[PDB]
mmCIF file of C-alpha atoms and ligand atoms in Angstrom:
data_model
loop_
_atom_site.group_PDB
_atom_site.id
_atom_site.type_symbol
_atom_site.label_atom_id
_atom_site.label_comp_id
_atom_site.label_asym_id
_atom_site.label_seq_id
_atom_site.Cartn_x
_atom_site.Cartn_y
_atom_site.Cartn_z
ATOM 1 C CA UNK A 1 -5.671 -4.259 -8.205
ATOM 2 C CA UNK A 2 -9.068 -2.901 -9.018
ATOM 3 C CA UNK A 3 -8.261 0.755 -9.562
ATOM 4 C CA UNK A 4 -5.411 2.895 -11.722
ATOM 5 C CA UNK A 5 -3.531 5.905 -10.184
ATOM 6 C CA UNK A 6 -6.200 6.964 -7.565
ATOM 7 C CA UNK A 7 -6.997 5.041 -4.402
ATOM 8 C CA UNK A 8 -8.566 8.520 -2.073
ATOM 9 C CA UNK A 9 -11.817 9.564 -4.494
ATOM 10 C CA UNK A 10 -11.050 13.406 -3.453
ATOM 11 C CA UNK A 11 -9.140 15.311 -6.287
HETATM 12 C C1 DAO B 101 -4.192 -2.105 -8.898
HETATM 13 O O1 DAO B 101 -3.913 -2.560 -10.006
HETATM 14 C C2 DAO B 101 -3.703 -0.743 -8.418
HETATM 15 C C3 DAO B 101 -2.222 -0.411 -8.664
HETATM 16 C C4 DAO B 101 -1.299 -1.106 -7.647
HETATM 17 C C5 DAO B 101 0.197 -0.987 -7.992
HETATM 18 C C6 DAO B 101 1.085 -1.679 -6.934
HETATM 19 C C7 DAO B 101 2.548 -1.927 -7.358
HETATM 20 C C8 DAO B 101 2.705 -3.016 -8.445
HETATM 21 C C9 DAO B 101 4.148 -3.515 -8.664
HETATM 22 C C10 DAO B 101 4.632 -4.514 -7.591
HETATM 23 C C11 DAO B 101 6.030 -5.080 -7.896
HETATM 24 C C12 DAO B 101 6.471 -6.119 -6.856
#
């Protein structure tokens, strides 16, 4: 809704 194609900030 807010983000694109990455919801866990890790990679
Ligand atoms: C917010 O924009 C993050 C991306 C979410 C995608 C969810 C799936 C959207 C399609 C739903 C169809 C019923």
């Amino acid at each position: 809704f807010q983000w694109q194609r990455n919801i866990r900030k890790v990679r």
